[PDB]
Design a protein around this ligand. Structure first.
Ligand SMILES: OC[C@H]1O[C@H](O[C@H]2[C@H](O)[C@@H](O)[C@@H](O[C@H]3[C@H](O)[C@@H](O)[C@@H](O[C@H]4[C@H](O)[C@@H](O)[C@@H](O)O[C@@H]4CO)O[C@@H]3CO)O[C@@H]2CO)[C@H](O)[C@@H](O)[C@@H]1O
Ligand SMILES: [Ca+2]
Ligand SMILES: [Ca+2]
Length: 418
């Protein structure tokens, strides 16, 4: 495990990570208080599958609850009330065992942290911040979903649960918890939640103070049309918007540019995600994914959230693309362990590693065929990737002696290594 910072000091940890999102939206409903026991038990498997890191659910207990017609949710971690680790995923004790088992097997533990808001209203909690002290966004005049004097970012829905993460005491509180996660819960890094909610610069601060040399990733889902008309971002590409967050937080960022192309364009247009960017300083900070707990389905109730789900006819192509290309790939728990894509994914992980493909590896796109046709310059081998293409042989697009590495879905997924 190579471990440095990128050339622009972004915390990509060697640019060689392969991450597993370790949960789906309905875990708290399907394996109540049993999730950490399940991970402990699966640690060796996760490690053998080839993952170098795992994105853990929020560790802070969440006993929230909501209902919206047929829709229902709560307890998943995004509306926590305390730093107490005895939540719906399992106890503190189990968490410790789980992180220890993962860590021992050589899988880094990345915690999902939610600094933007908390469950203000929860009656029995250990963290009680009174009103009128500047701790809350709503301590200030709250015009609309725009930064206010009590919160330098967007608000979460109503904004009544928004924290002034910039308040010296609120900042300090998060900072200590981050340090706590690293020293007693074996944190090798963090996934920063709802990043649009507070300044990017705060994320760099936090990382600097508690885990400067760790891995970090920001979850920024905000399209151009959500910025004010006068803002440059209102006219920028998805790529520019996320790259800008990354420059400021000094953390890799989820590639929502690739996700939007996967949902709205053709497979040939997948080349316009951050990860396909010709400048290595651009593509290396991209954290690729096919679906997450928000965008995809989940086993159980209501099929989870499925806000921007990738259709099944493209799941193999999508994994083939992310696992063989630049940026840092993320595998969704369900595709891997629930839905039967596990074998195919395992094969690609092996291909990626044998080729020595990394965050900054070069990628070239070949124009004369149908589908996506790309040449990837791994540090050990060159890969030719042809997805839903009329390409006949790797030699039509690259110099060298190629061997078939992968051939799935009636040749819709073809990968060759030199
Ligand atoms: O007190 C503040 C607000 O509280 C109430 O909001 C409810 C919402 O209406 C519910 O829908 C729900 O919210 C979920 C959200 O549905 C779910 O997607 C998840 O969101 C995360 C997301 O996973 C994550 O990836 C990330 O980037 O950001 C999101 C926020 O962290 O989790 C949310 C919280 O559980 O629950 C909230 C609170 O219970 C109320 O309705 C509002 O009026 C009020 O302002
Ligand atoms: Ca690394
Ligand atoms: Ca906010």
């Amino acid at each position: 495990d190579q471990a440095g910072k990128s050339p622009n000091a972004v915390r990509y940890h060697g640019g060689d990570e392969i991450i597993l999102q370790g949960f789906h939206w309905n875990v708290v409903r399907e394996a109540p208080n049993d999730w950490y026991n399940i991970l402990r038990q699966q640690a060796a498997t996760i490690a053998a599958d080839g993952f170098s890191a795992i994105w853990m659910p929020v560790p802070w207990r969440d006993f929230s609850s909501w209902s919206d017609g047929s829709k229902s949710g709560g307890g998943e971690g995004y509306f926590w009330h305390d730093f107490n680790k005895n939540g719906r995923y399992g106890s503190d004790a189990q968490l410790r065992q789980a992180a220890s088992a993962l860590g021992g097997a050589g899988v880094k533990v990345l915690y999902d942290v939610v600094p933007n808001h908390m469950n203000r209203g929860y009656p029995d909690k250990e963290i009680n911040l009174p009103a009128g002290q500047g701790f809350w966004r709503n301590d200030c005049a709250d015009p609309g979903n725009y930064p206010n004097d009590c919160d330098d970012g967007d608000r979460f829905i109503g904004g009544d649960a928004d924290l002034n993460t910039g308040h010296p005491q609120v900042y300090g509180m998060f900072r200590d918890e981050f340090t706590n996660l690293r020293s007693q819960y074996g944190a090798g890094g963090f996934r920063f939640d709802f990043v649009r909610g507070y300044a990017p610069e705060r994320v760099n601060s936090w990382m600097t103070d508690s885990a400067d040399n760790s891995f970090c990733v920001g979850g920024l889902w905000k399209g151009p049309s959500e910025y004010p008309n006068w803002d440059w971002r209102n006219t920028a590409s998805w790529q520019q918007i996320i790259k800008d967050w990354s420059d400021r937080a000094k953390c890799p960022v989820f590639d929502f540019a690739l996700k939007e192309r996967m949902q709205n364009g053709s497979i040939a247009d997948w080349k316009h995600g951050l990860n396909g960017n010709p400048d290595p300083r651009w593509r290396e900070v991209a954290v690729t994914f096919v679906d997450n707990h928000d965008t995809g389905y989940s086993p159980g109730q209501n099929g989870g959230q499925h806000h921007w789900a990738l259709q099944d006819g493209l799941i193999r192509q999508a994994y083939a693309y992310i696992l063989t290309s630049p940026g840092t790939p993320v595998v969704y728990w369900d595709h891997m362990y629930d839905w039967g894509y596990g074998d195919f994914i395992r094969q690609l992980i092996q291909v990626r590693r044998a080729a020595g493909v990394r965050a900054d590896s070069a990628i070239s796109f070949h124009s004369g065929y149908s589908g996506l046709v790309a040449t990837v310059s791994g540090s050990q081998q060159t890969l030719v990737v042809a997805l839903n293409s009329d390409l006949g042989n790797p030699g039509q697009v690259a110099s060298g002696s190629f061997s078939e590495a992968v051939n799935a879905s009636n040749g819709q997924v073809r990968v060759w290594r030199s």
